[PDB]
Structure 1
Amino acid sequence: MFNLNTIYLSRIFIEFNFYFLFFLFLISSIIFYFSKIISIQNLNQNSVFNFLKLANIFGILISFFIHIISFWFYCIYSYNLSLNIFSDINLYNSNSIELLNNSLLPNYFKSNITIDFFGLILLTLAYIVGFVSILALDTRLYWKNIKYIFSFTIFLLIVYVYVTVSNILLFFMCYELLLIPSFLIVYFVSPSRRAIQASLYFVIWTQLGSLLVLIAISYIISITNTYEFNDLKYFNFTNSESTIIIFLIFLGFGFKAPIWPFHYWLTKTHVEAPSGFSIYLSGFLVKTALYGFYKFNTSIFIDIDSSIFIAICIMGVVDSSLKMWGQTDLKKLVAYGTIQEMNIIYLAFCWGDSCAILGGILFSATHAFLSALMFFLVDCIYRRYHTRSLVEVNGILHITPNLGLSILFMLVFFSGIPGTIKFISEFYIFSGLLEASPFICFILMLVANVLGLIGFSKSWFNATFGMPKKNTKYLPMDLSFKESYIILYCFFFLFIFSYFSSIFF
């Protein structure tokens, strides 16, 4: 019963949501530039900053709704396309349906849009995490950094082109564009003075991996003059070229997606970055690397043993889990948790295009939401209690019961209770790893889910419980409606996404 109307509606929605975002950004930027001689806030109720905040927030939100609709259309379209290809067995019949483009808006960068489930999951993560982070950064943007209210819109446009393109070069360029806005945010919006050095560490560490990926892309392009991302089927790389490409790709994308030993920059940046931008970084900016690694390694044929890469990922997991205990800083502890989860996700991609990719994608989504939740809780603690250190913070539950309850439920979700996409992703990865290498699976599970979990829980429980006798004149009140509903939405997603259609998982 599938008809061409659904196909064209899917394509039109995907194409036009990008232009909706772009036109919103363009209008907002034109207003901002041409309303004032100097593009800084006027400290009065009639400033354009209020309009810009409104436009950014409710462009992201409306584009997120349209993205939900377009993602559902894509799911139907992909399912029915697979059915059309698979169903017919007659040799004379073949599915050759050709679509003509609309005459209203042009194709951005003269590229035909191609959408995949992983790309749309990444785009949904971008939308939601960007919404949370923009909601967080309101107190940070003041009177000279208001120009960074558009950072998340720029991120959304970059990610949209990144996930809706079938061109290798455009793919790589979109991946590399993410550096400038993130560096500028960390440099100009971070309150702490150590953020200045943290930004440089972030730039250099990420750029080393960017150069590695650039070398790999140069190898692919120079050898294969193609750029369509599908002509690689008709060209085979020799053993030496293939091993060089996989090594470069893995190391370069692991610089971004933190792997052992390349997580020093991540720890520094998470500790010294804005509490609202740490959410976006951990939640989304480390998963574009995973998506790019998946695309490249599934496109290239590799005839090498992945034991070395699996060992690197497992070593990162073990290192982060063991170090969890020794952190009294909640933000650094959450950063180590992010490193652990990202290393597990990266390990999920070490078997080419096997079924491990499904667990990897689900784990990427759950880690995004869980890291957003954890960093937002740390943000609330730091903002109301003027410290994010375990020695200075104690007995949160008895003065701010809602915040303590949020911490406890965050710990329960992090533990991986059944009924959560966290548990589902752990089940996928461990079920595969048990047959792949059962002893390695046992070691990984033991370390991560006992030693790292206990180290993680020690600090959070100590902060939540106790007796806050110190500085009774300065104790805060409670979570606000904004914070409470953000926490509730994170919990709601982590719980209900387990009912998403199992066809794609």
Structure 2
Amino acid sequence: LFFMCYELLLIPSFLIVYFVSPSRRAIQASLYFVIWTQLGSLLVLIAISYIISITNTYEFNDLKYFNFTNSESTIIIFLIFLGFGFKAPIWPFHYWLTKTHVEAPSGFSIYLSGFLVKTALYGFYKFNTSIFIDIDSSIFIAICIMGVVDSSLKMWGQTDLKKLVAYGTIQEMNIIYLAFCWGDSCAILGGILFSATHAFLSALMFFLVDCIYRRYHTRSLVEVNGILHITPNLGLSILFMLVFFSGIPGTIKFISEFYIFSGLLEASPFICFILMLVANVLGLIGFSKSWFNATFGMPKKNTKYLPMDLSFKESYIILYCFFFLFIFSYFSSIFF
């Protein structure tokens, strides 16, 4: 039932992208989404069929009384890692995610970054924890780190804001997926917290992009800037989003970074430094350039068509995202 519920999520998503998206390029983007996500689901299906046929049972408990050999364990771990990394986008498979975010409607983009990809982290975790694997996780760790580096190095050369948000989603999804590469150790707490952190951050960023697109009828830096000085609330929201994404020590982004980076520094010092420098400096600089240039300037072009500021709905949604980050920094310490 776990696998069936994971598989059930594709048809509504494809239908939403196909029938609700206004852009014409969304027709092919839905096909890309389907084909990559279904390749990943096929890999996961092969692994599940392997487990079910070898052990004629459907309970996670019974796996405690059966042992898998080295070959079967290696096959299963590779299959589940690749299959769940198709959906939670690992380095070589994020073309579908980029296209789908660029072409999809704003609400479904919020749902896709905020929640849907997380469905891959959960299932993998379960199948990672129920089996004894005697392989070295260096290959998976390297794949995840390559994803982080590749995504964060591409942020400077983005003019579309939605594509930039998609690349940020890719880098933090790969960071979270890294935390599950040590089994059932204490590394899972940082990943669990940072999943919610990314959910709220991505929801906020895509909502801001939607507000800009509905105000100015564009989401390209070459066409819109000076979002401040006209509708200042949107510019203030952009700047505060940039602060929270940078990770001020008062929020849960800093907490998740601290967890994962402490563990990685102990596990691999030079790797930790390289990942930290690539993610928190270069990608941050590209992100900040593309977002600052849109906030500041003079909106001179079309004064006859300039829009009004935020409505109550958008203001309250943005405020609630900020409040949730700040206040979930205060959750009970028994967990995490």
TM-score scaled by length of structure 2 = 1.00
Correspondence for 1:214 among 42, 45, 70: 45
1:311 Cα deviation from its structure 2 partner: 0.2
Structure 2 partner of 1:159: none
Give how far 1:491 is off: 0.2
Whole-Å separation in 1 of the counterparts to 2:57 and 2:323: 44
Do residues 496 (structure 1) and 327 (structure 2) align? yes
Aligned residue in 2 for 1:67: none
Please tell me whether residue 250 in structure 1 is matched to residue 66 in structure 2: no
> Which is bigger in relative contact order (C-alpha 8 A, separation at least 6)?
2
SS at match of 2:249: coil
Aligned partners of 2:4 and 2:188: how far apart in 1? 24
Cα distance per residue 1:178-205 (max 9 Å; x no partner): 0000000000000000000000000000
CA distance in 2, matches of 1:261, 1:409: 32
Question: For 1:409 and 1:290, how far apart are their aligned partners in 2?
Answer: 28
Q: CA deviation at 1:228?
A: 1.0
Once residues 229 and 411 of structure 1 are traced to their aligned partners in structure 2, the CA distance between those partners, rounded to angstroms, is 42
- Distance in 1 between residues matched to 2:122 and 2:251, nearest whole Å: 23
Residue 500 of structure 1 and its aligned partner are, at CA, apart by: 0.4
Counterpart residue number, 2:201: 370
Question: How far 1:316 sits from its partner (Å)?
Answer: 0.3
Gaps of 5+ in 2: none
Measured after TM superposition, the shift of residue 484 of structure 1 is: 0.2
Residue 258 (structure 1) shift: 0.7
2:60 & 2:310 partners in 1: Cα distance? 48
Per-residue CA deviation, residues 231-278 of structure 1 (Å, 9 max, x unaligned), is 000001000000000000000000000111100000000000001110
Question: Counterpart of 1:398?
Answer: 229
How far residue 474 of structure 1 moved from its aligned partner, in angstroms, is 0.6
Deviation, 1:229, is 1.2
Q: How far does the alpha carbon of each residue in 1:411-451 deviate from its partner, in whole angstroms, 9 at most, with x for none? A: 00000110110000000000000000000000000000000
Q: Say whether 1:231 aligns with 2:54.
A: no
Q: Indicate the percent of aligned positions where both proteins have the same amino acid.
A: 100
SS of the counterpart of 1:499? coil
**TM-fit CA distance, 1:409:** 0.2
1:346-368 Cα shifts (integer Å, max 9, x gaps): 00100000101000000000000
Q: What is the Cα deviation at residue 313 of structure 1?
A: 0.2
Q: 3-state DSSP class of the match of 2:135? A: coil
Whole-Å separation in 1 of the counterparts to 2:259 and 2:140: 19
CA distance in 2, matches of 1:353, 1:467: 53
Q: Distance in 1 between matches of 2:186 and 2:298?
A: 49
Number of paired residues? 336
Find the structure with the greater CA-based Rg: 1
CA distance in structure 2 between the aligned counterparts of 1:395 and 1:240, rounded to whole angstroms: 59
Distance 1:171 1:326 in 2: 40
Q: What is the 5 A alignment of 1:200-211? A: 200-211=31-42
Distance 1:416 1:262 in 2: 27
In structure 1, what is the equivalent of residue 112 of structure 2? 281
Task: Give the Cα–Cα distance (whole angstroms) in 1 for the partners of residues 332 and 237 of structure 2.
Answer: 29
Measure, in 2, the Cα distance between the counterparts of 1:349 and 1:324.
25
1:114-135 residue CA offsets vs partner (Å, 9 max, x unmatched): xxxxxxxxxxxxxxxxxxxxxx
User: How big is each residue's C-alpha offset from its partner over 1:308-345, in whole Å with a ceiling of 9 and x where there is no partner?
Assistant: 00000000000000001100000000000000000000
Output the CA distance in 2 between the equivalents of 1:402 and 1:388. 17
* Distance in 2 separating the partners of 1:411 and 1:230: 45
Cα distance in 1, alignment partners of residues 229 and 180 from structure 2: 44
How far 1:230 sits from its partner (Å)? 1.0
Secondary structure at 2:154 match in 1: helix
> Could you tell me how far apart the structure 2 residues matched to 1:334 and 1:191 are?
20
Distance between the aligned counterparts of 2:229 and 2:75, measured in 1? 57
Cα drift, residue 302 of structure 1: 0.5
Match of 2:273 in 1: 442
TM-score (norm 1): 0.66
Q: Distance in 1 between matches of 2:230 and 2:132?
A: 58
Q: Deviations over 1:74-127 (max 9, x none)?
A: xxxxxxxxxxxxxxxxxxxxxxxxxxxxxxxxxxxxxxxxxxxxxxxxxxxxxx
Shift of 1:489: 0.1
Calculate the aligned-residue CA RMSD, in Å: 0.4
Check if 1:195 corresponds to 2:29.
Answer: no
Q: Distance in 1 between matches of 2:60 and 2:13?
A: 28
Which residue of the partner structure matches residue 143 of structure 2?
Answer: 312
The superposition leaves residues 33-82 of structure 1 with CA deviations (integer Å, 9 ceiling, x where unpaired) of xxxxxxxxxxxxxxxxxxxxxxxxxxxxxxxxxxxxxxxxxxxxxxxxxx
Mapped partners of 1:175, 1:466: distance in 2: 46
Displacement of 1:388 in angstroms is 0.4
| Residue 453 (structure 1) shift | 0.3
Distance 1:235 1:474 in 2: 68
Residues in 2 aligned to 1:417 and 1:243: alpha-carbon distance in whole angstroms: 40
- Pairwise CA distance, 1:213: 0.2
Matched, 1:263 2:105: no
- Structure 1 runs of 4+ off > 2 angstroms? none
For 1:268 and 1:305, how far apart are their aligned partners in 2?
33
CA deviation after TM superposition for structure 1 residue 299, in Å:
0.5
Matched residue, 1:467: 298
